[PDB]
């Protein structure tokens, strides 16, 4: 939580005078960070689920929760209860620890990094953005991986509005356009 303890007071001071706040609790905050290894085409072989649950564990040290379907969409011929993907959610200390790694060490392994989209807000400004590979993270190398799968990161914040969330992220020095 190095970035947390360093930037909390600074972003509070900035945002209070920017948005005419009147309390410390009114500043937009950070709730959680979520990431799902959406492995869909894995019905034939379950080994893809294990590979996803190992790659996500390597990316963020935890045990990914193997998610189950709840609708059984016939467009892909699936039945509810079958494992589809795995999600990992981080709160507080782990959230901040993964945030600095996704902020600092995210560029070298990715190509054509000309910034990130500024309109990735779900109305309330929760910043769901996706990456197309896993070797982007320093933990995972390319020699030990067989398949290539991405991530569906989502940094869920307490910001009331999309512009407040954007100001939140800009103060956290995230590479927008």
């Amino acid at each position: 939580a190095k970035l947390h303890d360093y930037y909390k007071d600074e972003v509070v001071k900035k945002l209070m005078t920017e948005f005419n706040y009147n309390s410390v609790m009114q500043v937009p905050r950070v709730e959680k960070i979520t990431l799902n290894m959406g492995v869909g085409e894995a019905i034939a072989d379950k080994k893809l689920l294990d590979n996803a649950a190992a790659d996500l564990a390597a990316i963020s040290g935890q045990k990914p929760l193997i998610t189950k379907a709840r609708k059984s969409v016939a467009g892909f011929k699936i039945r509810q209860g079958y494992p589809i993907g795995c999600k990992v959610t981080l709160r507080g200390e782990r959230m901040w620890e993964f945030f600095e790694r996704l902020i600092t060490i995210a560029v070298p392994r990715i190509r054509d990094f000309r910034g990130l989209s500024a309109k990735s807000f779900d109305g309330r400004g929760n910043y769901s953005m996706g990456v197309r590979e896993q070797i982007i993270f320093p933990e995972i190398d390319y020699d030990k991986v067989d398949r290539v799968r991405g991530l569906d990161i989502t940094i869920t914040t307490t910001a009331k509005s999309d512009e407040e969330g954007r100001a939140l992220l800009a103060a956290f020095d995230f590479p927008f356009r």
Partner: peptide, 20 residues
């Protein structure tokens, strides 16, 4: 930073020095 990679990174061009 705290990470589960194990051995030290000794990585390459980073955010503080990327041509972005």
């Amino acid at each position: 930073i705290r990470s589960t990679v194990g051995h030290d990174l000794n990585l390459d061009v980073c955010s503080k020095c990327h041509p972005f």
